[PDB]
């Protein structure tokens, strides 16, 4: 019981309290917070957050917390992962790994790679790209002015000269999924930070500029490199391979802290593979740069300095390519050595998919489990320790939907024309989490021109999720005469629904059904964690109907269920899908 002149505060609570105070009342949390600089910004996306709160969705219950950027733990991070000797690896590992590479190399491109125009390096670049402990300017600023300094770096490197190489190590500030944790007792309030180790935004532009093709894997030369592959159509092509086996089994790759496991010889092996695709003139640039990465001096954000014995530095330009190639080769290596299947014969009995250290392969039940069992040991001595599990063997999948990749598994979808396909699935709880806390930082206070680009982006990815799909449609119904933001993953031109068709291949309205028992599972956590109420679904459905009832062409009617209830369809006008300020150019 609180005093009257104090109840006014209550008009502002928007979430249950988390203080867990025991002798002092803790009414609730407010919708806003305080900037690291004192300002008062929002926690979630307004439009989206509001719609979700309409139904019994409790934003405060979404498995999402921030990472601890404090130095105390930031150091505990370095000490717990990066502080390690290099993994002992069997002798011929790198010879036999190189051997496997040659069985997959394309002679057509051998020694054909060269430098690139500032005009393509500049394409899609994240300008606000870090600076480096001893560097004043960031990417963009370097691009604006010191563009010349970068050209001599390239020269000094091509000539294999002196270069004071070093990396800055800072804890990555970001919100992290804690779904698993909360699903079990551990109600963590925040999670350990990832240490980003990176070159100096000059040395970055220098390396990237000449090695654009390998790094940006334009001609994709890495077996099963799913890196430039949009996520919303990968399982369809993977379903193909699955269906091409008699008793298919999928085995996932689970290296514990990949980056932390790359050896010097691993880095050298990629150096070689790199020299295979680059013209002889650049081979010294590669040797010089590779030589430095074998032992890097690292300056932490607070001043400390450690001499890392070259593992991988997340901020290095060659992380995606390097890690991927190195991953496939090592997995291919392990597989063959476990089954006996000749290196050269891999593609005869197996199909592989890799994205960094993330990936899996598909083979017959026989070979597959022989690999999962003998792979633990073989990989371990190869220097890529697999996460220890109760099963004692690599994670095997006997069902297609049980295939996990890039934090997603295949969700079955039934189209109106009685055909099927699979989309990228994930626990709803998490989709909703990321959809509510993704705030774009084109710094801006965010529009409704950004929340639309986000909803559109989540539409392409999760149309198979009714709840999520409808939330998007509602957001997209707002302010029709205001184009979407380009600061989201994808954005659209013309009609959103028209655009959906553009990349998905089918129209939203043609989406007739979602695997019952798959969707069912992906919604289980929503209750365990009490994220929604037994009326949310109903409510969101009503929210939609309301809008699409009256005669007119409403973009909320592309949802079959809503359509049948309002009796109206939605006739799309053309639309086109596009990326925004990009990471790795997806080839849509």
Task: Output the DSSP codes for 94-146.
Answer: HHHHHHHHHTT--GGGTT-B----HHHHTTT--TT----TT-S--TTHHHHTT
Does residue 573 contact residue 502 with C-beta atoms inside 8 Å? no
Query: Does 311 share its domain with 451?
Result: no
Which residue, 409, 433, 457, sits at the end of a domain? Answer: 409
Task: Give bridge partners of residue 360 from the DSSP assignment.
Answer: 252, 353
* Residue 124, φ and ψ in degrees, nearest 5: 85, -5
Query: Does 27 share its domain with 101?
Result: no
d(CA 335, CA 361): 9
Resolution, expressed in angstroms to one decimal? 3.0
Query: Does 440 share its domain with 571?
Result: yes
d(CA 313, CA 199): 9
Does residue 242 contact residue 236 with C-beta atoms inside 8 Å? no
> Does some domain include residue 391?
yes
Task: Concatenate the DSSP letters of all residues of 412-464 into one string.
Answer: EEEETTS-EEEEEE--HHHHHHHHHH----SSS---SSSHHHHHHHHHHHHTT
Query: Does 371 share its domain with 466?
Result: no
d(CA 230, CA 460): 10
* Residue 415, φ and ψ in degrees, nearest 5: -90, 160
Does residue 116 contact residue 209 with C-beta atoms inside 8 Å? yes
d(CA 38, CA 310): 39
Q: Is 323 helix (H, G, I), strand (E, B) or coil?
A: helix
> Does some domain include residue 71?
yes
Q: What number of CA atoms fall less than 13 Å from residue 17's CA on the CB side?
A: 11
Question: Residue 519 contacts by C-beta under 8 Å, 6 or more apart in sequence?
Answer: 411, 464, 465, 466
d(CA 99, CA 101): 5
d(CA 217, CA 52): 39
d(CA 452, CA 472): 8
> Does some domain include residue 585?
no
Does residue 209 contact residue 150 with C-beta atoms inside 8 Å? yes
Two tokens, residue 234 = 């990968």
d(CA 64, CA 58): 12
Q: Is 162 helix (H, G, I), strand (E, B) or coil?
A: coil
What's the chain's Rg over C-alpha atoms? 26
Does residue 350 contact residue 104 with C-beta atoms inside 8 Å? no
> Does some domain include residue 113?
yes
Question: Residue 237 contacts by C-beta under 8 Å, 6 or more apart in sequence?
Answer: none
d(CA 471, CA 48): 7
Integer CA distances (angstroms), 330 to 110, 209, 273, 321, in order:
22, 28, 14, 14
Query: Does 364 share its domain with 307?
Result: no
How many Å from the N-terminal Cα to the C-terminal Cα in the chain? 59
Query: Does 555 share its domain with 442?
Result: yes
d(CA 335, CA 190): 38
Integer CA distances (angstroms), 84 to 30, 260, 318, in order:
44, 8, 22
d(CA 523, CA 517): 10
Of 58, 61, 51, 59, nearest in space to 541 by CA: 51
Q: Which residues of 226-247 are buried (b: 16+ CB within 10 A; e: fewer)?
A: bbbbbbbbbbbebbebbeebee
d(CA 225, CA 359): 9
Which residue, 376, 409, 442, sits at the end of a domain? Answer: 409
d(CA 529, CA 476): 28
d(CA 209, CA 174): 28
Does residue 434 contact residue 44 with C-beta atoms inside 8 Å? no
Of 582, 542, 580, nearest in space to 561 by CA: 542
| Distance from chain centroid for Cα 196 | 15
Query: Does 279 share its domain with 359?
Result: no
> Does some domain include residue 395?
yes
Q: Is 373 helix (H, G, I), strand (E, B) or coil?
A: helix
β strands within 275-366, DSSP E: 296-300, 305-308, 350-355, 358-364
| Binding-site annotation, residues for GTP | 229, 231, 426, 434
Two tokens, residue 286 = 């590669």
* Locus of tokens 């957050």: 49
d(CA 548, CA 558): 10
* Locus of tokens 């309301």: 546
Task: Give bridge partners of residue 97 from the DSSP assignment.
Answer: none
Does residue 504 contact residue 457 with C-beta atoms inside 8 Å? no
Query: Does 360 share its domain with 485?
Result: no
Return left, alpha or beta for 303; rule: phi > 0 is left, psi -120 to 50 is alpha, else beta: left
Two tokens, residue 239 = 């379903």
Query: Does 277 share its domain with 368?
Result: no
> Does some domain include residue 586?
no
d(CA 326, CA 67): 29
| Binding-site annotation, residues | 229, 231, 426, 434
> Does some domain include residue 112?
yes
d(CA 150, CA 143): 9
d(CA 180, CA 170): 26
> Does some domain include residue 83?
yes
Question: Residue 577 contacts by C-beta under 8 Å, 6 or more apart in sequence?
Answer: 460, 490, 492, 499, 500, 502, 503, 588
d(CA 383, CA 261): 7
Alpha helices in 355-450 (DSSP H): 365-381, 428-437
Query: Does 132 share its domain with 240?
Result: no
Integer CA distances (angstroms), 160 to 288, 370, 489, 522, in order:
5, 46, 39, 53
The CA dihedral of 543, 546, 549, 554, to the nearest 10 degrees, is: -50
* Locus of tokens 């009796």: 567
* Locus of tokens 């899996």: 360
Run of H or E residues at 448: none
Run of H or E residues at 84: none
Angle, nearest 10°, between helix axes 428-437 and 46-54?
140
* Locus of tokens 């050269």: 344
How was this model experimentally determined? X-ray
* Residue 245, φ and ψ in degrees, nearest 5: -130, 160
d(CA 242, CA 264): 36
Two tokens, residue 540 = 């969101």
Does residue 456 contact residue 472 with C-beta atoms inside 8 Å? yes
Two tokens, residue 570 = 């939605």
Query: Does 206 share its domain with 244?
Result: no
Q: How many domains does the chain have?
A: 4
Query: Does 90 share its domain with 9?
Result: no
Q: Are strands 167-171 and 296-300 parallel, antiparallel or unpaired?
A: parallel
Run of H or E residues at 575: strand 575-579
Q: Which domain holds residue 35?
A: 1-42
Q: Is 63 helix (H, G, I), strand (E, B) or coil?
A: coil
Which residue, 282, 305, 330, sits at the end of a domain? Answer: 330
Helix/strand number for the chain, H first, E second:
24, 17
Q: Is 175 helix (H, G, I), strand (E, B) or coil?
A: strand
């Amino acid at each position: 019981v609180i005093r009257e002149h104090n109840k006014w505060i209550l008009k502002k609570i928007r979430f249950q309290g988390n203080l867990n105070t025991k002798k002092m009342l803790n009414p609730g949390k407010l919708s806003e917070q305080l900037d690291r600089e004192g300002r008062k910004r929002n926690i979630y996306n307004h439009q989206i957050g509001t719609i979700m709160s309409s139904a019994g969705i409790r934003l405060e219950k979404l498995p999402i917390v921030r990472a601890q950027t404090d130095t105390k733990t930031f150091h505990e991070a370095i000490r717990d992962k990066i502080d390690k000797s290099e993994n002992r690896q069997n002798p011929e590992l790198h010879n036999k790994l190189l051997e496997i590479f040659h069985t997959i190399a394309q002679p057509t491109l051998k020694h054909t790679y060269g430098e690139v125009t500032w005009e393509q390096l500049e394409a899609g670049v994240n300008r606000k790209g870090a600076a480096g402990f001893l560097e004043k300017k960031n990417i963009g600023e370097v691009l604006d002015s010191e563009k010349h300094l970068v050209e001599q770096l390239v020269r000094d490197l091509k000539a294999g000269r002196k270069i004071k190489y070093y990396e800055t190590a800072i804890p990555k500030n970001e919100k992290r999924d804690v779904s698993d944790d909360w699903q079990a007792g551990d109600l963590v309030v925040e999670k350990r930070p990832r240490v980003i180790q990176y070159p100096e935004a000059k040395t970055r532009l220098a390396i990237t500029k000449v090695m654009y093709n390998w790094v940006k894997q334009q001609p994709v030369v890495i077996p099963g490199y799913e890196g430039k592959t949009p996520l919303f159509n990968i399982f369809d092509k993977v379903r193909k391979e699955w269906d091409s086996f008699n008793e298919p089994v999928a085995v996932s790759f689970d290296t514990k802290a990949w980056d932390t496991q790359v050896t010097s010889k691993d880095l050298q092996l990629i150096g070689e593979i790199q020299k295979y695709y680059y013209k002889k003139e650049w081979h010294k640039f590669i040797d010089t740069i590779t030589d430095h990465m074998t032992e890097v001096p690292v300056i932490t954000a607070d001043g400390e300095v450690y001499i890392r014995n070259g593992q991988r530095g997340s901020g290095q330009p060659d992380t995606s390519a390097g890690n991927s190639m190195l991953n496939v080769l090592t997995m291919m290596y392990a597989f063959c050595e476990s089954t006996g299947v000749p290196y050269k014969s891999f593609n005869r009995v197996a199909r592989i998919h890799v994205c960094g250290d993330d990936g899996f392969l598909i083979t017959e039940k026989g070979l597959g489990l022989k690999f999962a069992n003998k792979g633990m040991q073989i990989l371990h001595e190869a220097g890529k320790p697999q996460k220890i599990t109760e099963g004692e063997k690599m994670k095997v999948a006997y069902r297609f939907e049980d295939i996990e990749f890039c934090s997603h598994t295949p969700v079955p979808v039934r189209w109106s024309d009685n055909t099927s396909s699979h989309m990228a699935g994930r626990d709803t709880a998490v989709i909703l989490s990321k959809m509510a806390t993704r705030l774009d930082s084109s710094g801006e206070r965010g529009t409704t021109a950004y929340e639309k680009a986000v909803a559109f982006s989540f539409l392409l990815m999760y149309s198979w999720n009714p709840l999520v799909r409808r939330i998007c449609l509602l957001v997209l119904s707002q302010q029709p005469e205001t184009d979407p933001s380009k600061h989201a993953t994808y954005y659209y031109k013309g009609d959103p629904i028209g655009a959906y068709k553009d990349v998905i291949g089918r129209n939203l309205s043609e989406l007739k059904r979602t695997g019952f028992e798959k969707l069912a599972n992906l919604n289980l956590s929503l209750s365990t964690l009490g994220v929604w109420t037994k009326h949310t679904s109903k409510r969101i459905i009503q929210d939609c109907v309301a809008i699409g009832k009256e005669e007119g062409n409403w973009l909320v009617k592309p949802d079959r269920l809503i359509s049948s209830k309002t009796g109206h369809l939605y006739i799309p006008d053309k639309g086109f899908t596009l990326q925004g300020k990009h990471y790795e150019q997806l080839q849509l």
